[PDB]
Amino acid sequence: LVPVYIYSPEYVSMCDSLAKIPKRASMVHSLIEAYALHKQMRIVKPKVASMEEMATFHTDAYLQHLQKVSQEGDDDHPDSIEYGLGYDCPATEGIFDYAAAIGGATITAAQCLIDGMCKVAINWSGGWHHAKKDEASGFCYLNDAVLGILRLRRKFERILYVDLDLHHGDGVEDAFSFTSKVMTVSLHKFSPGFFPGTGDVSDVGLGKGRYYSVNVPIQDGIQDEKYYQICESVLKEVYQAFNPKAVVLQLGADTIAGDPMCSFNMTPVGIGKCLKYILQWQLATLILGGGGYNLANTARCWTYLTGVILGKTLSSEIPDHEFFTAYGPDYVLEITPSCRPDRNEPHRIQQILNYIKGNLKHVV
Numbered sequence: 011l012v013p014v015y016i017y018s019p020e021y022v023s024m025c026d027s028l029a030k031i032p033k034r035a036s037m038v039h040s041l042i043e044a045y046a047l048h049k050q051m052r053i054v055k056p057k058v059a060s061m062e063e064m065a066t067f068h069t070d071a072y073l074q075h076l077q078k079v080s081q082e083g084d085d086d087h088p089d090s091i092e093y094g095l096g097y098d099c100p101a102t103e104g105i106f107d108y109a110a111a112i113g114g115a116t117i118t119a120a121q122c123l124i125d126g127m128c129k130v131a132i133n134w135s136g137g138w139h140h141a142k143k144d145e146a147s148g149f150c151y152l153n154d155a156v157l158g159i160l161r162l163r164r165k166f167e168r169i170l171y172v173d174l175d176l177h178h179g180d181g182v183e184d185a186f187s188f189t190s191k192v193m194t195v196s197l198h199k200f201s202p203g204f205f206p207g208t209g210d211v212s213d214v215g216l217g218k219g220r221y222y223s224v225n226v227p228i229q230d231g232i233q234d235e236k237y238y239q240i241c242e243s244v245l246k247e248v249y250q251a252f253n254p255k256a257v258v259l260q261l262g263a264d265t266i267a268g269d270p271m272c273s274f275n276m277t278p279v280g281i282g283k284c285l286k287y288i289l290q291w292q293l294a295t296l297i298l299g300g301g302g303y304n305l306a307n308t309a310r311c312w313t314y315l316t317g318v319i320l321g322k323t324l325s326s327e328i329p330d331h332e333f334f335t336a337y338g339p340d341y342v343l344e345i346t347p348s349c350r351p352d353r354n355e356p357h358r359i360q361q362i363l364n365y366i367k368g369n370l371k372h373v374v
């Protein structure tokens with residue numbers, strides 16, 4: 011009944027070493043620790059994922075190339091482009107060890123769930139939902155989300171993946187697009203140009219997995235109240251229809267007000283309400299991070315979200331800790347929405363929601 015918190019020092023230091031997002035793993039843990047929240051959770055050291063574990067989703071040719079690049083680095087290896095490495099996914103040294111750490115942590119979280127050690131397991135350094143079996147994508151080198159769902163499938167016949175990152179959870183969806191055993195649900199920005207340009211509402215899945223993919227395309231400037239209306243509308247239908255035995259929950263904090271992505275206008279209370287709704291099902295629940303590029307706001311969010319998993323209520327004033335200065339000028343936990351318009355027209359949202367109601371009527 012106490013949640014598992016997947017953490018070691020060596021795990022956090024490796025997750026700090028991915029550029030374009032420096033010292034973020036550390037900032038999140040540092041703030042969670044400063045609120046004394048680790049004292050109410052079970053700290054479990056992540057194992058490193060083996061080649062075989064990693065190969066349950068990914069092709070060996072990809073993993074082997076990823077291993078080579080990690081020792082050397084892009085020069086003397088023009089084969090990189092084939093496997094998704096490039097500017098978006100730098101082919102820098104040490105990444106196969108990061109890949110393995112991340113996949114291992116999500117897998118370790120899933121095993122804690124299977125063993126009955128907990129109802130909730132947390133790996134905030136995970137959530138790398140874009141990676142394909144044989145291709146890096148959107149800064150994701152390894153699909154830990156997929157590796158965890160597959161581990162969960164040993165104990166739990168039906169699994170629900172709910173992806174609340176700003177981006178469409180395309181890699182996870184694609185992995186399970188042809189099966190009814192895993193339902194993927196995704197709320198995301200979907201607009202011409204925006205990555206990855208998939209996950210329109212009409213993306214419903216294929217073959218035996220038709221209607222077992224669900225996608226909510228949302229436009230910029232959505233705030234807490236409206237997002238939760240959309241989210242619990244979709245999730246109420248999904249619970250009754252699909253009836254999941256277990257939940258994998260990606261809570262990417264690039265939807266938050268103040269993020270470089272500057273698309274959605276959410277606060278961690280808005281997401282927290284979506285998280286409470288999934289928690290009240292009292293199912294085995296694997297919690298994952300993901301995108302989150304205003305590093306302080308991301309820690310504010312994921313720290314707040316940990317509090318709600320615990321049922322605790324945190325103080326507004328940020329505790330003094332290693333990265334205290336990053337939380338200025340106000341030094342508070344709460345995030346204020348930007349003053350931008352909400353481009354989601356109500357009629358367009360309602361016809362999206364009714365379409366999903368209708369697709370979920372088919373689920374047996």
Ligand SMILES: O=C(CCc1ccccc1NC(=O)c1cccc(C(F)(F)F)c1)NO
Nearest residue numbers: 030148149175177205262264270300301303
């Ligand atoms: O949000 C993501 C992946 C991120 C991504 C996908 C496709 C194209 C670009 C990105 N991310 C960035 O460009 C990015 C992320 C963090 C910081 C910056 C920077 F340029 F501001 F540094 C840029 N997954 O949920």
Ligand SMILES: [K+]
Nearest residue numbers: 173175177197
């Ligand atoms: K999403």
Ligand SMILES: [K+]
Nearest residue numbers: 186192219222
């Ligand atoms: K599916």
Ligand SMILES: [Zn+2]
Nearest residue numbers: 175177264301
């Ligand atoms: Zn994202």
